[PDB]
Homo-oligomer: A and B are copies of this chain.
Amino acid sequence: MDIDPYKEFGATVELLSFLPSDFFPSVRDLLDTASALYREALESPEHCSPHHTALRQAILCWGELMTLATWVGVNLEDPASRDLVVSYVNTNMGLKFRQLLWFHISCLTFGRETVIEYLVSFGVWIRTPPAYRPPNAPILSTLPETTVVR
């Protein structure tokens, strides 16, 4: 139905189409981050935020895909097909869900404004050739660059 899951929030896929695959933590890492930060909010009987509602659906569908992968690994005697399907799932679908979970966890930790400005700047950066761009990518952090907590 030609839906963009970020348009509802202020972004698009074209804005995140720049962020490489080497930028997004693993799905297990992102799910651990969520469990640690907003678990009592994702498991709560309140909508909390549109970002919280979106996070719950993404986690559910990833769980369904993981169940699919285990079921395949168990019920497919053909190891070639088994491997190909499981690896396709992990790589591609995990990339989609990594984009998604990162976007939501970030728009929750930081704000939509900050995340969108970071995306604009990261686009400026990753579009620029290496011979003309700074080597140190732009960075989004809760900590100062000195990373000393007091």
Question: Is the interface on chain A under 10, 10 to 19, 20 to 34, or 35 or more residues?
Answer: 35 or more
Known: A57-B57, A60-B3. A121 touches B135 (CB 8 A): no
Known: A8-B44, A43-B1, A47-B50. A134 touches B123 (CB 8 A): no
B60 touches A72 (CB 8 A): no
Q: Which residues of B contact A121 (CB under 8 A)?
A: 140-143, 149
The smallest beta-carbon distance between A92 and chain B, in angstroms, is 7
Contact of A64 among B61, B84, B143 (CB under 8 A): B61
* Complexed CA–CA distance, A43 and B12 (Å): 12
Q: Which residues of B contact A146 (CB under 8 A)?
A: 136
| CB contact list, A29-68 vs B, under 8 A | 29-37, 39, 42-48, 50, 52-54, 56-61, 64-65, 67-68
A45 touches B133 (CB 8 A): no
Kindly report how many copies of this chain are found in the complex they form together.
Answer: 6
Q: Which residues of B contact A81 (CB under 8 A)?
A: 75-78, 81-82, 85
* Complexed CA–CA distance, A88 and B114 (Å): 41
Q: Which residues of B contact A44 (CB under 8 A)?
A: 7-8
Binding site for B on A (CB under 8 A): 1-5, 7-10, 12, 14-15, 17-18, 20, 22-23, 25-26, 29-37, 39, 42-48, 50, 52-54, 56-61, 64-65, 67-68, 71-72, 75-78, 80-82, 84-85, 88-89, 92-93, 96, 109-110, 114, 117-129, 131-150
